[PDB]
Design a protein around this ligand. Structure first.
Ligand SMILES: O=C(O)CCC(=O)C(=O)O
Ligand SMILES: [Cl-]
Ligand SMILES: [Fe+2]
Length: 289
């Protein structure tokens, strides 16, 4: 069906305590991945145990009998006048939460309440957000370094960026846990999930299955905003989640950082080797879809 793709001990090693020097040393390999595959990968020693602990707290939060997670559903959580929707998204056979940079900062006031209600999860969600945001900002300079001179800094927004933490459960007979898709935003950073099943398409249309469950491998996804800003040079890193039919009580945990620029900032594109300034904003780009 779908061939497995080994990355552990193949992808460049990026230590968080040495992140800038390691990302500079990794940049030639990462550029080769984007060119050759259409998504990028780095092995980040220790990140797997940090993400596993964070996702285990999220699962415990999903089960909890006081405080309760559905009291922080997105429709009872303060939202920015301009922005995406953060907060809990009750039961795709999944429930998930969006922890935004704004929520970590308690913006608007009360947005942070879920992080205080579930502090074991909330501390670890902020830890993983910060790790992921540092990595993805450096992947964003790799991609910018591949583009023409004059390409603007991606200027990823801390507050507009979201960590999505997903708990798949009661999947019954599903084969498809996540349909074929790409992120609307600039970049995604897929953190090591609890199980296999996430698959990516290669430039020739072949689907492959990164070996990432219980590893320290992270994947970096091109989103549609960067496809647009690159005038179609970098296709979205289209992906999906499959499973063989599973028994009752099967669960899967996965987390991904969605990195957004400022919604109010005007769009741009590198066209014909030159910066083209657009009237529409990044918020307009989202609203278009
Ligand atoms: O469950 C996963 O591993 C990936 C989920 C994903 O692609 C997404 O939520 O956009
Ligand atoms: Cl996505
Ligand atoms: Fe995705």
């Amino acid at each position: 069906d779908v061939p497995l793709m080994e990355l552990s001990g193949r992808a460049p090693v990026v230590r968080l305590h040495d992140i800038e020097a390691d990302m500079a040393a990794a940049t030639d390999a990462i550029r080769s991945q984007l060119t050759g595959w259409g998504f990028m990968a780095a092995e980040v020693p220790g990140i797997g145990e940090r993400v596993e602990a964070m996702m285990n707290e999220f699962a415990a939060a999903c089960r909890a009998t006081g405080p309760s997670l559905s009291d922080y559903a997105y429709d009872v959580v303060p939202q920015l006048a301009v922005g995406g929707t953060h907060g809990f998204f009750p039961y795709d056979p999944k429930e998930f939460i969006h922890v935004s940079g704004a929520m970590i900062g308690d913006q608007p006031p009360g947005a942070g309440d879920v992080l205080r209600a579930f502090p074991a999860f909330g501390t670890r969600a902020a830890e993983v957000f910060d790790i992921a945001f540092r990595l993805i900002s450096l992947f964003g300079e790799v991609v910018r370094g591949m583009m023409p001179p004059g390409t603007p800094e991606l200027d990823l927004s801390h507050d507009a960026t979201n960590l999505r933490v997903i708990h798949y459960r009661d999947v019954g007979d599903r084969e498809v846990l996540a349909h074929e898709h790409s992120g609307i935003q600039m970049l995604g950073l897929q953190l090591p999930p609890s199980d296999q099943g996430l698959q990516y398409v290669l430039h020739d249309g072949t689907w492959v299955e990164p070996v990432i469950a219980g590893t320290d491998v992270v994947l970096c996804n091109i989103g549609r905003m960067l496809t647009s800003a690159s005038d179609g040079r970098f296709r979205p890193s289209t992906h999906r989640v499959h499973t063989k039919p599973m028994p009752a009580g099967y669960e899967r945990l996965s987390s991904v950082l969605f990195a957004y620029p400022q919604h109010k900032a005007r769009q741009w594109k590198m066209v014909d080797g030159e910066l083209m300034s657009l009237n529409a904003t990044w918020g307009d780009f989202i609203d278009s879809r």
